[PDB]
């Protein structure tokens, strides 16, 4: 019977699962009732993967699909250029899920043919169209692509969504995929006893409302999602008990639930304090299995 | 004493330890018996990153810095901002290694501070020209950058390289830095080292597939970084294994300087021909003088 572990290293070093950039920080939601449908980012603690998320980093928020050389529509694939089917997903594994926003697109045509020239094409998509339709291979691009083939990419920048009424970057909310999407990852939400979801958080290049960092929050660091795809560990309780350790001094700063859906949440010590105020170098260690029943020390 | 394990997925899943772009092949080196030096994916299979070696695909392939305005030096710090101590490193973790081309990047300032237009600046570095001295923790970018600050990027593509006679590009090649892990030899018994090939964007004089090689997966060091597995042998016999039927398709030797290798069935045969939706599976811990069962079509 297979011990649950998670990953002997520090947080600092590990990537955000909806964008593949570094973990600057923890978050609460700046509404702590608030609930997240995310589909990169989700795996249950037994190793089963949900929604769109990918096994590597190398995967996550990327897209690929032919297009016809003067036009707009990318006609969508898997990453390794297989047919997707939406049975069992909402899109492609990979698939960004930044909702509430524009992507600007870079992208290029595989493989390469080329003996010159800049293969690079970037373009912008409005996820919020109505031909936003993922869950049926496909989405349209706002400029049209001179050179036709085979495109893998990723986006680039984001910025406030068009159509919106001027609504700010809102990296809380999924996209629309459907157009009806049936096979989403189910949404989270805090599950009582004073608990509150830590959310991950790092930066994406592009401009909103405020003026301020661009920060995309997920559920779990990359890298954990991956040891629980290898691992498979049975659960063995209604929550896993962890702790935030300082791993040259040993001492425990935070304790925290990670829930069998894949989702972590603990205790703040008050609304000014919170896992916002702990440093990035601690390293989370697997205690032992409690009921949900079970109260956590107040963190900070 | 944890047993030591690779991780138990497919290697189609898994990512290249120079760029952060999936695993597409095993390939060997054009002669195949070449030592590389590649900075990033070295990493002991006790867990000892080499070289920039980062533990994160997000860390991999990629650099930060401050450039004045109206100035071309881009200034390097580690990827979280924090100085870069020249001295225990060749670059900051996770600087890219590919040699024997340009550059063609894309980066923006962090954090951003902006309510309109596109953040995004690109620009070029010859990393055989002068100037490019990471050691020295500053790298010159071919034009002037408009808007100082602090930048962090990648590579968003490659060509060959300029000022160079007009040699392609070579990515069995690392760039002068200006600590370095070691090279790696194959070590004998008709063994070669084996490489595990991703794509990067970039034109090259063939007009063919744009491959970086790597000595590992990077997915298998983060689980050596976590894991820290005592070595009890010179080479850790591994089978690549067809999770369907449990069927081995072939032997390999995991060297603890963190280099894979087989015995190629014959000139032209060998992993290159396997399929990349096996698993490397642990078998046991070997002396360096064992033989391996031959892979790849029989001549």
Same mark, same amino acid.
């Given at each position: 019977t297979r011990p649950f572990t998670v990953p002997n290293i520090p947080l600092k070093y590990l990537s955000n699962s909806r964008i593949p950039n570094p973990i600057e920080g923890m978050s609460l939601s700046p509404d702590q009732t608030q609930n997240v449908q995310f589909q990169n980012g989700?795996?249950?603690?037994? $190793? #089963? %993967?949900?929604? @769109? @998320? %990918?096994?590597?980093?190398? #995967?996550?928020?990327?897209?690929?699909?032919?297009? @016809?050389? $003067?036009?707009?529509? !990318?006609?969508?694939?898997? !990453?390794?250029?297989?047919?997707?089917?939406?049975?069992?997903?909402?899109?492609?594994?990979?698939?960004?899920?930044?909702?509430?926003?524009?992507?600007? /697109?870079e992208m290029s045509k595989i493989p390469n043919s080329s003996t010159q020239n800049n293969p690079i094409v970037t373009n912008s998509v409005k996820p919020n169209s109505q031909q936003f339709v993922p869950h049926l291979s496909s989405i349209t691009l706002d400029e049209n692509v001179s050179s036709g083939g085979d495109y893998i990419g990723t986006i680039q920048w984001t910025s406030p969504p068009?159509?919106?009424?001027?609504?700010?970057?809102?990296?809380?909310? /999924?996209?629309?995929?459907?157009?009806?999407? *049936? #096979?989403?990852?189910?949404?989270?939400?805090?599950?009582?006893?004073?608990?509150?979801?830590?959310?991950?958080?790092?930066? /994406? %290049?592009?401009p909103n409302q405020s003026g301020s960092p661009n920060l995309v929050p997920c559920l779990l660091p990359q890298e954990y999602i991956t040891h629980f795809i290898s691992e498979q560990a049975p659960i063995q309780g209604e929550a896993a008990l962890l702790h935030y350790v300082d791993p040259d001094t040993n001492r425990n700063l935070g304790e925290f639930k990670l829930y069998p859906g894949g989702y972590l949440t603990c205790v703040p010590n008050s609304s000014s304090t919170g896992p916002q105020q702990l440093p990035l170098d601690g390293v989370?260690?697997?205690? *032992?299995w409690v009921s949900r029943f079970y109260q956590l020390k107040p963190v900070g």
């Amino acid at each position: 019977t297979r011990p649950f572990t998670v990953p002997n290293i520090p947080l600092k070093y590990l990537s955000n699962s909806r964008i593949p950039n570094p973990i600057e920080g923890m978050s609460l939601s700046p509404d702590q009732t608030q609930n997240v449908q995310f589909q990169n980012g989700r795996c249950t603690i037994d $190793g #089963q %993967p949900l929604g @769109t @998320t %990918p096994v590597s980093v190398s #995967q996550l928020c990327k897209f690929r699909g032919r297009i @016809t050389s $003067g036009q707009r529509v !990318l006609n969508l694939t898997e !990453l390794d250029g297989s047919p997707f089917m939406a049975f069992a997903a909402p899109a492609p594994a990979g698939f960004p899920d930044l909702g509430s926003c524009d992507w600007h /697109i870079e992208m290029s045509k595989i493989p390469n043919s080329s003996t010159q020239n800049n293969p690079i094409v970037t373009n912008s998509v409005k996820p919020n169209s109505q031909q936003f339709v993922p869950h049926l291979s496909s989405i349209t691009l706002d400029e049209n692509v001179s050179s036709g083939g085979d495109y893998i990419g990723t986006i680039q920048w984001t910025s406030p969504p068009s159509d919106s009424g001027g609504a700010n970057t809102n990296f809380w909310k /999924i996209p629309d995929y459907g157009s009806e999407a *049936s #096979q989403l990852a189910p949404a989270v939400y805090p599950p009582g006893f004073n608990e509150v979801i830590v959310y991950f958080m790092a930066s /994406i %290049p592009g401009p909103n409302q405020s003026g301020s960092p661009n920060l995309v929050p997920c559920l779990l660091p990359q890298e954990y999602i991956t040891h629980f795809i290898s691992e498979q560990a049975p659960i063995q309780g209604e929550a896993a008990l962890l702790h935030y350790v300082d791993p040259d001094t040993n001492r425990n700063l935070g304790e925290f639930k990670l829930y069998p859906g894949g989702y972590l949440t603990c205790v703040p010590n008050s609304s000014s304090t919170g896992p916002q105020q702990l440093p990035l170098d601690g390293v989370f260690v697997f205690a *032992s299995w409690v009921s949900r029943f079970y109260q956590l020390k107040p963190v900070g």
